[PDB]
Amino acid sequence: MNLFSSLTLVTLILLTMPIAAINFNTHKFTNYPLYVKTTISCAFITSMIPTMMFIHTGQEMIISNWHWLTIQTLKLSLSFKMDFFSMMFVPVALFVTWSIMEFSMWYMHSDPNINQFFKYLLLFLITMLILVTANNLFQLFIGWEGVGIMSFLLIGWWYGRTDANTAALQAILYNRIGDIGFILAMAWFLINLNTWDLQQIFMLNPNDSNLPLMGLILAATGKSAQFGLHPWLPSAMEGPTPVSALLHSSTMVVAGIFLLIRFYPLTENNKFGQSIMLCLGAMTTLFTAMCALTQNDIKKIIAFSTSSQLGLMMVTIGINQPHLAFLHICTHAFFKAMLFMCSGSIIHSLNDEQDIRKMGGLFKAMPFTTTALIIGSLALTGMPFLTGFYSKDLIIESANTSYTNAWALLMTLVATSFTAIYSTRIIFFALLGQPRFPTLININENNPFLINSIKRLLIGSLFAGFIISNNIPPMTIPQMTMPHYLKMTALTVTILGFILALEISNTTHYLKFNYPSNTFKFSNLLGYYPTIMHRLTPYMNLTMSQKSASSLLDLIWLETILPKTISLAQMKMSTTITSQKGLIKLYFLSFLITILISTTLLNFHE
Amino acid sequence: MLKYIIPTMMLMPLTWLSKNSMIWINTTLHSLLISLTSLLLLNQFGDNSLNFSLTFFSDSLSTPLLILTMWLLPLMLMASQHHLSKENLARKKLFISMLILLQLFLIMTFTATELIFFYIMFEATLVPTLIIITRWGNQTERLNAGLYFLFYTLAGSLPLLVALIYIQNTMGSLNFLILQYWVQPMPNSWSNTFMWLACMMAFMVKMPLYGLHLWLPKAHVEAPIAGSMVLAAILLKLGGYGMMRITLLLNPITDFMAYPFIMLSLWGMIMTSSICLRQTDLKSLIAYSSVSHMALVIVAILIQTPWSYMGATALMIAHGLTSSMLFCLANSNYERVHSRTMILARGLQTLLPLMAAWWLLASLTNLALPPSINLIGELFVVMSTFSWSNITIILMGLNMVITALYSLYMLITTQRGKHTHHINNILPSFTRENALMSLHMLPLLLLSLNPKIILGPLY
Amino acid sequence: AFLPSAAYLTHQQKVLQLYKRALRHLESRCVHRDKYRYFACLLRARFDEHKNEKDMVKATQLLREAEKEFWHGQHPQPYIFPESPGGTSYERYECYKVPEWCLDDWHPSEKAMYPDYFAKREQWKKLRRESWEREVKQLQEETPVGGPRTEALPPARKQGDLPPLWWHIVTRPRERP
Amino acid sequence: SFPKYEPSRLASLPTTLDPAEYDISSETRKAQAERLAIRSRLKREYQLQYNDPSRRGVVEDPALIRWTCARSANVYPNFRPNTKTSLLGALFGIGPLIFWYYVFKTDRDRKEKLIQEGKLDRTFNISY
Amino acid sequence: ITKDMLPGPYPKTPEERAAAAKKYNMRVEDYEPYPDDGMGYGDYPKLPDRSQQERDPWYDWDHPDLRLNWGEPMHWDLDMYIRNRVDTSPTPVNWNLMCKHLFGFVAFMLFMFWVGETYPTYQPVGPKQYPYNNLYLERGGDPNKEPEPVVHYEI
Amino acid sequence: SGYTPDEKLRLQQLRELRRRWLKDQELSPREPVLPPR
Ligand SMILES: CCCCCCCCCCCCCCCCCC(=O)OC[C@H](COP(=O)([O-])OC[C@H](O)COP(=O)([O-])OC[C@H](COC(=O)CCCCCCCCCCCCCCCCC)OC(=O)CCCCCCCCCCCCCCCCC)OC(=O)CCCCCCCCCCCCCCCCC
Ligand SMILES: CCCCCCCCCCCCCCCCCC(=O)OC[C@H](COP(=O)([O-])OCC[N+](C)(C)C)OC(=O)CCCCCCCCCCCCCCCCC
Ligand SMILES: CCCCCCCCCCCCCCCCCC(=O)OC[C@H](COP(=O)([O-])OCC[N+](C)(C)C)OC(=O)CCCCCCCCCCCCCCCCC
Ligand SMILES: CCCCCCCCCCCCCCCCCC(=O)OC[C@H](COP(=O)(O)OCCN)OC(=O)CCCCCCCCCCCCCCCCC
């Protein structure tokens, strides 16, 4: 007990110490990014011990160490839930963040505000581990809004750029729309169960949990870029490459998925919520992987890749397999962070070029980036016995062999083929073929920061699926008996995707020119949704906000009814009183009329 | 409460007998000492309110408003000493006297044991505010704004006088402590309907209610910075304080008299946030944000659950600090570009990085970032309005989305993008300005550590 | 249409802008360099066919339906250069383009850190404030009545005189500060 | 032939497809020359003040002050209460208030009827 | 700034229209005000309702972030048509065709999720069987009551 | 056609002044002159 809780809190306090260091500074640092990278490496080391002694026994505890507030029956405490989810996500996120920061010491080197960048990146890590370790909804909301605000600050990093500010405000918009449902869930649990703690939620175990689970699905739609609230994540590639690699691939965008996995004892008892999650996840993994097929910016292709994998995670939550979904989070982190790091290595080596149509021939000019990008693409598509296999193969073999929405399953398999298609699109245009970049070759991947940072996630992408799948305990009963066309579904559909896209990419060398079909313009313009809605909804909101609200109500009508009409009425009565002609005859004639009215008409003499 | 009234009156000879270069430093120092002394009011008990005399008492509602009021005076002196630097010495002492006198009225407004003393002090707070706006306001519209500020409040409050003297003749007393035990139910009649309106409409104007808020984006804009600070931080909260006192007497008629005003405020928090999305004046954007935040406090008082009162008093204190800091940031740019147009000075993070950090933190507290007491008050009001009706979560969430939108739109517009080329008098941030920003923000962040002293009488 | 020097676009300029847009969008459609080179020679032939056209009405009509051709056959996400508007690195470094007058507001302890730079800056500021009145009276004697017709600026004519309105063109920030 | 581009309010017509761009007539040449002359005179008037060594302040734009005074301070003197403004002030002013009033009144009457019948499950509700 | 440089009421005579067109620094023939329906525009020009994104990004603007010049009459909704906000630029696909394809795709996907919900897939198995009367005490059953015996047999 | 002779002369003079400015933007070998730590 004493070792587990101590190293648990020492991990988080160790991560907060460089924030005190960057705030209590006078000098220019002796390499503060090296200090934060060393701190996160040592925090990974510190977090490995409670993980090992969870793998030994299954040891879990709650650390409710600080009573913060008591609202008459709601004792709010700083409470840390050290369960399977925290024990398997904290070292994965620390290992990935350690590799992202050693990548960042190379990528963000010429930036004169590199200390602010590492401060912001560590603040994201602190808020994310506040999110994933929280035991009540208030502290989880703190980590939730914290990763939202650090998402803002890291998307709009180059704040002179209009598109960065626009994409950051977009991300805040979609995440606050998800926060509507998050606060709906908090309100429901407080009113109907008198708690925000997960323990009383799980022990009271409500049956009419349709509405709070709808709120949690809305929160995960906002946070994990599901359909309807998806377009902030491809816009979120406007920030720097380590921002994308850490936050918007592996660590931040799995938080809504982590929220719905965190409420697995309530989603396991609600078939309506499982069907909603299944249809939403299949919709997302179809639509975003369909958008990724005809994109040209490499970071957009990998952002639609990670939103397709988030749709797949929402699918496997929807089939009552939450631990497979969390395994796929911890699996997806390694190779998707490494895919963004390889793409950023290409971007730096080709002088800030992010377009795959100006690449090629990097199979030999960038051999290590090529090796790791091929390995990450194979782990993304579900090559056998890499890290992506031990999650994605089980997700497909469990979504097939279950009482399932059949259209959701069929769109899941079409998405599985599309993953292979856009992965070999990345490999074809970025690596293979002939060079299309400009003529001054400054290709160089010879920094040990870059080599080591890709190397550790490369060892992760080779072995982490095997290691984690053999170290996690059984939490469900795995379906291991199925017919052979149904066992071989994912591999056959992935090979058909590779063959189909080999045909597609080899028909790009032919001397034919074809006008683009409507399916090409649909898939290339993001399914028209960031074009239609981002023009139409701000139009109807801001025209209303000016014309109705600012002008017509609160400069015209609410000013007209009470103050202006009363002022004009008292003005007019003032002019009727004092428009006398100064004639004594008329004043005494009015006095006579007064006395006549008082006698005859008002009976004041009676 | 006399140990706070007497030093505030002794600030008058302290500001009139000071040396001509010492009249800011002495008033700042001794008002900081009064603000240090204000913490003795935290002697609160779970059963009894801290009842001083026949005239003064302080429960856990009036105590945070008192500490915020006594804390606001040195910060108003710091904010207002740069643009009144070239002023006459006598007019400078008159400005400081109006600030000290407004604090003197407020600290015995919140502690008024008897309600007509509350009314006299409550309407006494108009006169120094009116003199500050119409005398040391900058543009032409300050006279019209003083007219609107005076004649909405008195139009609302002169029925309140007749209502309170009626309660004095009926119950025999307007002592709030006696009326905690002699309160009778107020049944349904037209007489009691207009009783409810006469007791509530003055405070609805002071909050302000949506539809009656038209005094506010002219009084808060056309005031100087000390006027804007006190109007945003204390003088809107006089209305919520009076509501939380006077709704003791208005039961059970409030349970159906509240519906039109709950509709007005639940729709006004949407409409005024939408107005904030399309403001060209930065100071007016902060004014309509204040209307949008006080709409929730109106809903929380009118639904009168304990969670709603706790969230309303937390949101009143949090909004006082946040809106005062937003007006001070707006003044820090107005003292450089000499225009309140928000689109004029752009890209200011490239020029003033630490001042842009203060902009970031005040915009984060404006959007209710947890665990700030902004989010605590916001969240408790949302809990209580959800328990009121489950469909109010749509309006509360849509308000939170638009609130985040105009907060970060304000931040991006003033601080981000390419800087304005033809503006070259952007000085570095003075130590006075950064100290003002930190003395707003650091108590607002430290109150997240121990938030129980701002959750009212029924924490 | 919209130019600082001219009031309009000529027909020849519209044809050249169409030809450049068509080659760029074709290069977006025709990613590989040999295939783009083939179809770009075909497009050069399609522009060289109606090249020696002396009927301005016929050339205007061919230009208009060629714009309809280009609009029907444009790439939806064309290749944009990174520092080109729309590109992924456009206006990225504008947050590092601090203007020159911000050096005037430095404390003297950090002006003492760069003595030769500020000592060499004072002669630039001196040169500008002696050039200013001469370049103002240069502009007012050359500009006709009713104000200038175009946004073109005249160069310096004497020796020793600097070109008029030169300061915020010369002392603009770099592209990679 | 080719599908004609149909312009919308939020997707305008391109310059390359607009039929009025290709005008060579002398009235369009004089209009564009006069617009270039106005823009050039305003450009000169700006950048004479902008390049001044003696100026240290704000080159004030009267167009910006004119825009803000149109947006706020001149709206009500240019207002006439007529059919269009009164119907838009009644529809957009008291319409949503009446709407949310009947919505929340219906919902709360339903909730109170279920509570006083013991039908609304209120077992663990003690925070309110 | 002074009185005759501020906006005024709606122009009715052509010399008032010419004075207003001189005031807003633009041609008399290009000056159109908003129509006098009393909404409160005065003499302010109705500019052609374009976003600032459509402005020439290569032209040397006086405000390069805004793509706007000094002295140029601003649009009424200039705060709305900034490049951080509503874009009106010409789209490669028509607006109505975009709306039809997006609405048809979303409606078809929702209709097919409803069909697949109505016709779900499954596996040719029975229900999962559990000991101890379908786990009566494990599922929170009270021990004072006795459940009906749920007996499962070998096959 | 290309530039006018006035435009080429102005670009030449602005180019010379710009290159003088950018050459003056270099550091000295003694700069930054630091205070003693
Ligand atoms: C009673 C004892 C209490 C002791 C502990 C105190 C607790 C916190 C108090 C307040 C802390 C913030 C104040 C400093 C920041 C503001 C000024 C600033 O910009 O400085 C930068 C400057 C260093 O930057 P620089 O590069 O030199 O210049 C600035 C740059 O130009 C440009 O700047 P920049 O943009 O690069 O950097 C700004 C950066 C920008 O980053 C952000 O804005 C991101 C922040 C939001 C997202 C992440 C946080 C989300 C919430 C989670 C954390 C809270 C809960 C955690 C618990 C677990 C979960 C329940 O912000 C920060 O780094 C702030 C770090 C701390 C964040 C706290 C939350 C602020 C967010 C808004 C409110 C949120 C809710 C309230 C939370 C209250 C918690 C107590 O800092 C300093 O020099 C420090 C000066 C001294 C600060 C003292 C603070 C305490 C004073 C209290 C006095 C009385 C009590 C005695 C105790 C004293 C202890 C020291
Ligand atoms: C580098 C500085 C560190 C300290 C170095 C010097 C000391 C050396 C080491 C010895 C440690 C100090 C002695 C022991 C510590 C004190 C023990 C003790 O009983 O303390 C009393 C208590 C313990 O709790 P408690 O339950 O006894 O008291 C709470 C108080 N009442 C009951 C009145 C409500 O307080 C602390 O320990 C304070 C530390 C808090 C740590 C967490 C801070 C969170 C910051 C964010 C706030 C907002 C969160 C909001 C959301 C929360 C979730 C809903
Ligand atoms: C912000 C501007 C608007 C402010 C609005 C303020 C509230 C609106 C309603 C105010 C009504 C007047 C005060 C009522 C005090 C009630 C005291 C009392 O005992 O009531 C019960 C008494 C009952 O009579 P009684 O007390 O003699 O009898 C004993 C009680 N019974 C009947 C049971 C035996 O009510 C009245 O006598 C009349 C109350 C209504 C008075 C209507 C006249 C005023 C109309 C509205 C004017 C609003 C402001 C207009 C101007 C705005 C600026 C230009
Ligand atoms: C289980 C349920 C699942 C349900 C899923 C679906 C639910 C939601 C349905 C869609 C609603 C949200 C989407 C519409 C608004 C999108 C706004 C946005 O993203 O704006 C971005 C836009 C710029 O974007 P872009 O065009 O990409 O920029 C490229 C470079 N110029 O930026 C701008 O133009 C700036 C805009 C600033 C002002 C924003 C005004 C609009 C605010 C909308 C509020 C919506 C509130 C919804 C409340 C719901 C309550 C239940």
In sequence order, the 6+-apart residues with CB closer than 8 A to the CB of C91 are: A160, A161, A162, B418, C85, E65
Q: C interface mutation test: which of A109, A161, A354 has the most C CBs within 10 A? A: A161
Record: contact B264-D97, CB cut-off 8 A? yes
Task: Tell me the CA distances in angstroms from E64 to A486, C100, E61, E122, one per residue in order.
Answer: 59, 17, 5, 61
Contact C93, A159 (CB under 8 A): no
| Per-residue buried b or exposed e for C37-63, using 16+ beta carbons within 10 Å of the residue's own CB | eebbeebeeeeeeeeeeeeeeebeebb
| Per-residue buried b or exposed e for B12-31, using 16+ beta carbons within 10 Å of the residue's own CB | bebbeebeeeebbebbbebb
Contact B230, B102 (CB under 8 A): yes
Contact A148, A134 (CB under 8 A): no
- Cα B350 from Cα A160, distance rounded (Å): 9
Q: Give the Å distance between the CA of A242 and the centre of ligand 4.
A: 26
Instruction: Provide the 8-state DSSP code for B51.
Output: E
Q: Give the Å distance between the CA of D109 and the centre of ligand 3.
A: 29
CA B276, chain centre distance (Å): 18
Q: Which residues pair with A579 in a beta bridge?
A: none
E63 part of contact set with chain B, CB < 8 Å: yes
Instruction: Provide the 8-state DSSP code for A70.
Output: E
Chain C residue numbers with beta carbons less than 8 Å from the beta carbon of A240 are none
Q: Whose CA is nearest to atom 46 of ligand 4?
A: B398
Residue E24 tokens, joined: 């807003």
Task: Note down the domain range covering B54.
Answer: 1-459
Task: Tell me the CA distances in angstroms from E92 to A232, C29, C40, D13, one per residue in order.
Answer: 22, 14, 22, 11
In sequence order, the 6+-apart residues with CB closer than 8 A to the CB of B255 are: none
Task: Tell me the CA distances in angstroms from B278 to A216, A457, B274, B405, E63, one per residue in order.
Answer: 32, 47, 7, 11, 20
Q: Which residues pair with A404 in a beta bridge?
A: E121
Give the distance from residue B287's alpha carbon to the nearest chain C alpha carbon, in angstroms.
30
Place of tokens 């690449």: A359
C114 part of contact set with chain F, CB < 8 Å: yes
Continuous segment of H or E residues that includes residue B320? helix B306-337
Residue B70 tokens, joined: 């006594």
- Cα B335 from Cα B348, distance rounded (Å): 14
E61 part of contact set with chain D, CB < 8 Å: no
- Cα A458 from Cα A336, distance rounded (Å): 11
Angle, CA of B366, B372 and B377, to the nearest 5°? 80
- Cα C1 from Cα A309, distance rounded (Å): 47
Of B231, B58, B262, the closest CA to residue B153 belongs to B231
Choose among C74, C76, C85: nearest Cβ to E57: C85
Contact C90, A354 (CB under 8 A): no
C53: left (phi over 0), alpha (psi -120 to 50) or beta: beta
Q: Whose CA is nearest to atom 17 of ligand 2?
A: A66
Count other C-beta atoms under 10 Å from residue F12's C-beta.
12
Q: Round to the nearest angstrom and report the end-to-end CA distance of chain C.
A: 34
Q: Give the Å distance between the CA of B437 and the centre of ligand 2.
A: 27
D-proximal residues of C, 45-104, CB under 8 Å: 56, 60, 63-64, 67-72
For chain D, the maximum distance between any two Cα atoms, rounded to a whole number of angstroms, is 84
Task: Tell me the CA distances in angstroms from A180 to A173, A219, A261, B131, C104, one per residue in order.
Answer: 11, 7, 19, 44, 49
- Cα B459 from Cα B452, distance rounded (Å): 7
Record: contact E65-B417, CB cut-off 8 A? yes
Contact B235, B206 (CB under 8 A): yes
Q: Which residues pair with A71 in a beta bridge?
A: A74
Instruction: Provide the 8-state DSSP code for B61.
Output: T
Q: What is the 3-state secondary structure (H, E, C) of A547-585?
A: HHHHHHHHHHHHHHHHHHHHHHHHHHHHHHHCCCCCCHH
Continuous segment of H or E residues that includes residue E90? none
Of C85, D39, D63, B60, the closest CA to residue E1 belongs to D63
Radius of gyration, CA atoms only, chain B: 21
Residue B404 tokens, joined: 């985040």
Instruction: Provide the 8-state DSSP code for B214.
Output: G
Q: Round to the nearest angstrom and report the end-to-end CA distance of chain D.
A: 68
- Cα A141 from Cα A137, distance rounded (Å): 6
Angle, CA of B151, B157 and B158, to the nearest 5°? 90
Count other C-beta atoms under 10 Å from residue A26's C-beta.
4
Which of A66, A81, A136, A138 is the pocket-test mutation for ligand 2 (most atoms within 8 Å of CB)? A66
Place of tokens 């999720």: E113
- Cα B401 from Cα B277, distance rounded (Å): 11
Residue A75, phi then psi, degrees to nearest 5: -80, 105
- Cα B111 from Cα B55, distance rounded (Å): 8
- Cα B352 from Cα B35, distance rounded (Å): 30
What sign results for the dihedral spanned by CA atoms A577, A580, A583, A589?
negative
Contact A138, A79 (CB under 8 A): no
Q: What is the 3-state secondary structure (H, E, C) of chain C?
A: CCCCCCCCCCHHHHHHHHHHHHHHHHHHHCCCHHHHHHHHHHHHHHHHHCCCCCCHHHHHHHHHHHHHHHHHCCCCCCCCCCCCCCCCCCCHHHHHCCCHHHHCCCCHHHHCCCHHHHHHHHHHHHHHHHHHHHHHHHHHHHCCCCCCCCCCCCCCCCCCCCCCCCHHHHCCCCCCC
Residue E7 tokens, joined: 């906006």
Concatenated DSSP letters of A277-332: HHHHHHHHHHHHHHHGGG--BHHHHHHHHHHHHHHHHHHHHHTT-HHHHHHHHHHH
A166 part of contact set with chain C, CB < 8 Å: no
- Cα E116 from Cα E113, distance rounded (Å): 5
Give the distance from residue E102's alpha carbon to the nearest chain A alpha carbon, in angstroms.
6
DSSP-derived 3-state class of residue A370: helix
Amino acid letter for position C173: P
Contact A322, A261 (CB under 8 A): yes
Concatenated DSSP letters of D54-72: S--SB---HHHHHHHIIII
- Cα B184 from Cα A232, distance rounded (Å): 56
Say what the alpha-carbon torsion angle D58, D63, D68, D69 is, to the nearest 10 degrees.
110
- Cα A358 from Cα A351, distance rounded (Å): 11
Q: Which residues pair with E33 in a beta bridge?
A: E45
Residues with CB under 6 A from ligand 1: A 23, 78, 116, 123, 127, 130, 139, 142, 146, 149-150; B 353-354, 357, 360-361, 364-365, 369, 371-372, 442, 445-446, 448-449
Instruction: Provide the 8-state DSSP code for E39.
Output: B
Residue E74 tokens, joined: 């601003």
Q: Is B193 in the pocket of ligand 3 (CB under 6 A)?
A: no
Ligand 2 atom closest to Cα of residue A138: 54
Burial class (CB in 10 A: 0-12, 13-18, 19+), D11: buried
Task: Tell me the CA distances in angstroms from A157 to A49, A122, B211, one per residue in order.
Answer: 35, 15, 40
Give the distance from residue D19's alpha carbon to the nearest chain A alpha carbon, in angstroms.
25
Of A489, A514, A149, A89, the closest CA to residue A323 belongs to A89
Q: Which residues pair with A197 in a beta bridge?
A: A136
Residue A134, phi then psi, degrees to nearest 5: -75, 145
- Cα B321 from Cα B447, distance rounded (Å): 11
Instruction: Provide the 8-state DSSP code for B281.
Output: B
Choose among B275, B347, B408: nearest Cβ to A172: B408
C91: left (phi over 0), alpha (psi -120 to 50) or beta: left
Concatenated DSSP letters of A448-488: HHHHHHHHHHHHHHHHHHHHHHHHSPP-S-------HHHHT
Chains E, F in contact: 3+ Cβ pairs under 8 A?
A: no
Helix A137-155 / helix A114-133 crossing angle, nearest 10 deg: 160
In sequence order, the 6+-apart residues with CB closer than 8 A to the CB of A276 are: A213, A214, A217, A318
C74: left (phi over 0), alpha (psi -120 to 50) or beta: beta
Amino acid letter for position F25: Q
Give the distance from residue E73's alpha carbon to the nearest chain C alpha carbon, in angstroms.
16
CA A9, chain centre distance (Å): 26
Q: Which residues pair with B186 in a beta bridge?
A: B252
- Cα E5 from Cα E105, distance rounded (Å): 53
Q: Which residues pair with A77 in a beta bridge?
A: A67
DSSP-derived 3-state class of residue E68: strand
Q: Is A547 in the pocket of ligand 2 (CB under 6 A)?
A: no
In sequence order, the 6+-apart residues with CB closer than 8 A to the CB of A153 are: A120, A168, B360
DSSP-derived 3-state class of residue E43: coil
User: Residue A498: CA atoms inside 13 Å, Cβ hemisphere, count?
Assistant: 13
Number of H helices, E strands in chain A: 27, 2
Of B292, B407, B325, the closest CA to residue A168 belongs to B407
- Cα B208 from Cα B230, distance rounded (Å): 15
Burial class (CB in 10 A: 0-12, 13-18, 19+), E134: middle
User: What technique was this entry resolved by?
Assistant: cryo-EM
Chain B residue numbers with beta carbons less than 8 Å from the beta carbon of A550 are 274-275, 278-279
B409 part of contact set with chain A, CB < 8 Å: yes
Contact B282, B342 (CB under 8 A): yes
Instruction: Provide the 8-state DSSP code for A428.
Output: I
Q: Chain A: residue nearest E117 by CA?
A: A405
Place of tokens 């949690």: A216
DSSP-derived 3-state class of residue D124: coil
Mark out chain D residues that contact chain E at CB-CB < 8 A. 3, 5-14, 31, 34-35, 38-39, 42-43, 45-46, 59-67, 69-71, 74-82, 84-85
Residue B46, phi then psi, degrees to nearest 5: -75, -25
Of B81, D123, D26, D76, the closest CA to residue A560 belongs to D76
- Cα B40 from Cα B268, distance rounded (Å): 38
Write down which chains contact chain D via at least 3 CB pairs under 8 A: A, B, C, E
- Cα A406 from Cα D43, distance rounded (Å): 65
What sign results for the dihedral spanned by CA atoms A154, B433, B440, B126?
negative
Record: contact C163-F14, CB cut-off 8 A? yes
Number of domains, chain B = 1
Residue B277 tokens, joined: 């999305």
* C154: preceding bond cis by omega (within 30 degrees): no
Amino acid letter for position A397: E
Say what the alpha-carbon torsion angle D5, D8, D12, D14 is, to the nearest 10 degrees.
10
Give the distance from residue E61's alpha carbon to the nearest chain C alpha carbon, in angstroms.
10
D11 part of contact set with chain B, CB < 8 Å: no
Q: Chain D: residue nearest B284 by CA?
A: D72
Count other C-beta atoms under 10 Å from residue B376's C-beta.
27
Of A439, A455, A436, the closest CA to residue A447 belongs to A455
- Cα B357 from Cα B325, distance rounded (Å): 13
CB pairs under 8 A between D and E: 119
- Cα D67 from Cα A113, distance rounded (Å): 37
Give the distance from residue A276's alpha carbon to the nearest chain E alpha carbon, in angstroms.
10
Residue D116 tokens, joined: 């006083």
- Cα C47 from Cα C44, distance rounded (Å): 5
Choose among D42, D74, D78: nearest Cβ to E69: D42
In sequence order, the 6+-apart residues with CB closer than 8 A to the CB of A253 are: A223, A224, A225, A233, A247, A306, A307, A310
Residue B51, phi then psi, degrees to nearest 5: -105, 105
Residue C73, phi then psi, degrees to nearest 5: -115, 40
Q: Which residues pair with A64 in a beta bridge?
A: A79
D121 part of contact set with chain A, CB < 8 Å: yes
Of A440, A530, A428, the closest CA to residue A170 belongs to A530
B338: left (phi over 0), alpha (psi -120 to 50) or beta: left
Instruction: Provide the 8-state DSSP code for B112.
Output: B
Place of tokens 């052509």: E14
Query: What does DSSP say about strands A74-82 and A61-71: parallel, antiparallel, or unpaired?
Result: antiparallel
Continuous segment of H or E residues that includes residue A82? strand A74-82
* B371: preceding bond cis by omega (within 30 degrees): yes
Radius of gyration, CA atoms only, chain E: 35
Length of chain C: 177
Contact B123, B156 (CB under 8 A): no
- Cα B142 from Cα B145, distance rounded (Å): 5
- Cα A357 from Cα A352, distance rounded (Å): 14
Say what the alpha-carbon torsion angle B293, B296, B300, B306 is, to the nearest 10 degrees.
-60
User: Residue B317: CA atoms inside 13 Å, Cβ hemisphere, count?
Assistant: 33
Say what the alpha-carbon torsion angle A571, A577, A579, A581 is, to the nearest 10 degrees.
-170
- Cα D83 from Cα A107, distance rounded (Å): 63
- Cα A117 from Cα B339, distance rounded (Å): 33
